[PDB]
Amino acid sequence: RRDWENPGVTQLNRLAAHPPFASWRNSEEARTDRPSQQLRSLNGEWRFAWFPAPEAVPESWLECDLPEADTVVVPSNWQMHGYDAPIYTNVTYPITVNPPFVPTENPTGCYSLTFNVDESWLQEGQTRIIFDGVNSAFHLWCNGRWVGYGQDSRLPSEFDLSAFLRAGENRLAVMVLRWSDGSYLEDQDMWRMSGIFRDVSLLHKPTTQISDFHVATRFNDDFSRAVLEAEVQMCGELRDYLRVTVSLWQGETQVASGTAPFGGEIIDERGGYADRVTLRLNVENPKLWSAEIPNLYRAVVELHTADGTLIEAEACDVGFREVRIENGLLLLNGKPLLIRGVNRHEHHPLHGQVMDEQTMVQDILLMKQNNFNAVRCSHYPNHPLWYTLCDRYGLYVVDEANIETHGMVPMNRLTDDPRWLPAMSERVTRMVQRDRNHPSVIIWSLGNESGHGANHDALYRWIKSVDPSRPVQYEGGGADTTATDIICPMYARVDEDQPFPAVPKWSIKKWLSLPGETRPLILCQYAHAMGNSLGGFAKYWQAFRQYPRLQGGFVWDWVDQSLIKYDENGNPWSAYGGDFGDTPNDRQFCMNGLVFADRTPHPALTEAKHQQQFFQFRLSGQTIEVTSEYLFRHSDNELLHWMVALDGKPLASGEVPLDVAPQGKQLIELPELPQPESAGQLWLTVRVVQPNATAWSEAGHISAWQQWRLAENLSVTLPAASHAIPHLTTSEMDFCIELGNKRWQFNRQSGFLSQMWIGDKKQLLTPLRDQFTRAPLDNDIGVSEATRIDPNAWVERWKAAGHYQAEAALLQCTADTLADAVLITTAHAWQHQGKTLFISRKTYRIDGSGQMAITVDVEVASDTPHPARIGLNCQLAQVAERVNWLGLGPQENYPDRLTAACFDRWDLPLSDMYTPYVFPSENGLRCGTRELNYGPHQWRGDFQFNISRYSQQQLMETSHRHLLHAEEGTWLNIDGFHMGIGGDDSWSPSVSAEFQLSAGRYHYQLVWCQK
Amino acid sequence: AALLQCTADTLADAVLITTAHAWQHQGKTLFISRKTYRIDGSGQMAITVDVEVASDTPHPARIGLNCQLAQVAERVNWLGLGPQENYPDRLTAACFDRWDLPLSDMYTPYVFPSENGLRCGTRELNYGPHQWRGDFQFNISRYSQQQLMETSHRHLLHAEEGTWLNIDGFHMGIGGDDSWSPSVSAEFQLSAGRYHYQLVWCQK
């Protein structure tokens, strides 16, 4: 039948979908969510053989183990075991577009398991098998007999195995197809893998059983009273003596309980549902659920007889909260949300798409610790445990159907096709059926990048009809179609419109007010954290805070999808698209996360953390005003620490308890500040520290910070005049300057400082020269590639202008002696094919104190693309252990991504001064630096710098960090000016005008001396 | 202006004068100006200026130089924005070209006198025998900033001797969203803390 090439057959013999069950046979276990002996895991070692097509599978496998099979752990993705290659393709489908067909060579994974079943499960009741995740379709046999088939790789497929098993040993056989017509609906931008990748379990339920249950909670106007409504359905024989009891508990206290026989109210001319009952429980002053305080109750649903015998129990965590859109705003418990969200795919660098509880927990804790309060399931329903974690830790969730047909042309070709409505319907309906009792899910999504088709409209209505408790969103077709309650664009800019035909991406501020528009706007994806990125992040937050209807967004995205490979030496390395021989592929576009695949943060996460703070601050005088952005909680685990330092030198500090109601303000007066000892800038830094541990943080966690400059006393004191004057030696070849133990050499033919010595030690490996380029970031390169250049990408503009190839022409090099110093004057022109790109005029003035003051004035031709940077660079001879500086830090920071950095004195090992992005590029800059110390050298001024053992040239020539090699010495890049890094998206220029070096003329000054 | 340093060095084909000053009030140093004047064998005087402004002092209205020239000439010719008066936050209509007007057109007769007649984006200014070149903003007229600020009606102003030249490296915006509260937008406030500008003064 080739059911895998027919969108009309998405399953055979599969059981209905329903919320998580466990069939407890003890009610107390159900109350506390204890393991159920009736719900067994079949995870562990299974038998597996790979074939190139279903046609190659031997019939013998149905009845007997294949001797050639191997033993492997399940769940797993077979690519992760090496049986075939995983493929990283973004939009283009990994298979030829010829719906509903798939390739004839279609990798088939044959899995089997011999396992025991006790007679007690078979004497009464029903025994079903549950596959929580099988990618992408499969047939199942039990003891040689065919049982059924299923599609939708991200929802559980359940089959009744009652009539197929026997006491003792039994054998399952699962034939899993890599590609199927379901693949047409699974075009998400992620690695393409396959296998039995989520749990497999066996559940025993009695013949008379709870087959479904829906919990709703409704409130009065101020949320001081709620009614919990639980509709319960049964299967099996109706009998007057059956009863359902629904009890609600808060911890160990029973709050309410209600019992009723089956028999629902009249629904229409034919009667009501005799197989259902709805229990209604009143709750006075309920403790409400929120991401701020995830208060939970437990609903326990008991199926029993009137005389008191329990048949079985099911149950769930219940969070009392209301979600609604009113007057253009999304409200939770009546208050308007500010979504500090992130998209998160299910990805593990070693396990592929298999998720585990440790990793899940680790992600949620980092999220919370980084001031995220919400997550979008991009782009499919997740492993069931994720929802339980979000309910208990407290995160708002966007649950999204596993529907993405991005590679179709036009994008809605299938979603506007009624013949695809069935398949799409089950992807939405089965998800709601499974997840509708989780309080953490606050919004449903119809899928991702599948255009806008009538199928969407039908499904949007279906959800609105069956679950009015939550809004429905969907971005396809323009982000604001009739299929979305929320304007949910991806990568729309704050102030800049991108007026694409048919599906424009308007500036978000402007979008809200188009004629007739009244919906809230929450970006489904924003700020593309690929590589050195997140430039412009603060611009979103300032807009979200100023505009009521801009209610936030989900950052793109949480974690890089890099996979681990091993080199010839067995050492691991991070790989991306094309590294498995996969092609076509989309190379590094699979890595766009705030964190690396192992969960180590990239520097951008700190930027997110700061912009997403829940406390805002203002300073007036000595008065700090703290305003809380919490909607529900008081600041009862928070104190404010303040410190004032003079040029990094600590002057005073204190602590004050924060006592701020939600949305309230607190005024803190700082104490009088005595006058600092000397000249300099006083700076105030305040931080909010949580003194007590929480379920998601350690005691002492810092949740927010901010700084301000205080009084400045400019230095007006004259330095004590040199007890010696420098000596110049002129030669045809060089201008040399000597002063004591020091010596500086200026090459007269190049016009550069080519060498310096301290004692008899040379300090330079390469001369000090102007630098106007950077090893291109992912955002500078965009979609450009050698075989397919994007002439609009910054990198190509610079390349085409000759920025990377221009050579300095010396125009002038002179030496003069002053009363107390020697003065070298240079001027160089950088040219390309006859065009003068930049002109650098400098003076170096070396005085009796041993200091070399460098003044630089650059001219940039107005018609050349604005340059990446304006600075100097050199390779120093030394490698020292520490980097110490007075400037912004401690982490990497760029012009358009420096708000989280603080001005202070920082000292880190040199390796921390390098950010190991997988795809290497310019990295490690620190901006707003007034002093930098390395080895015996000190440089002072107002500049940006990076320092590491890798040259810009090496960085731009290397595609994978594991291939980099430390060079002799230390490469220092000191910039007077650096361009922004951008990031609103990674496929089009995204550096805002104010961060482009378009001024024409630039000036900067450095003092280089010994320390 | 307290003098912190004033030196002279003779060079190969010029004389360099270096100066440093601090403006203070009550003991607070508001601004520091560091300059070098380089006079070469060609007769040109290159001035370089580096100013520091205390971060805690209100952002200043301008950062520039001024003098009263002895000369009074009929025309003003410049290469920059014009022809009419233009300020940083009000110069979109002005065009960059070579303009030449009579001196009085370089004065705007606001009934309540104030700073006026500036022209921005100027690369060369000619007045009588003088020529200034660089990238500055300037105004030029027979009235001192002092006179403007102390006179409340345009009809009471009197031409002073000579000509007042105000040449700025930077000038704050004029604002106008309203006239009863501060309205100069942040981007047009002089808050950079350190400012650099340079000019060359020569004859003809």
Ligand SMILES: OC[C@H]1O[C@@H](O[C@H]2[C@H](O)[C@@H](O)[C@H](O)O[C@@H]2CO)[C@H](O)[C@@H](O)[C@H]1O
């Ligand atoms: O992380 C990748 C990102 O891609 C966006 O799609 C881009 C695509 O990368 C680009 O090659 C093409 O020019 O434009 C597409 C946008 O139309 C996806 O929108 C986003 O979801 C991610 O998949």
Ligand SMILES: [Mg+2]
């Ligand atoms: Mg099918």
Ligand SMILES: [Mg+2]
């Ligand atoms: Mg037991």
Ligand SMILES: [Mg+2]
């Ligand atoms: Mg047997």
Ligand SMILES: [Mg+2]
């Ligand atoms: Mg896509």
Ligand SMILES: [Mg+2]
């Ligand atoms: Mg214009």
Ligand code: NA
């Ligand atoms: Na808002």
Ligand code: NA
């Ligand atoms: Na991607």
Ligand code: NA
């Ligand atoms: Na507190």
Ligand code: NA
């Ligand atoms: Na590179």
Ligand code: NA
């Ligand atoms: Na006046």
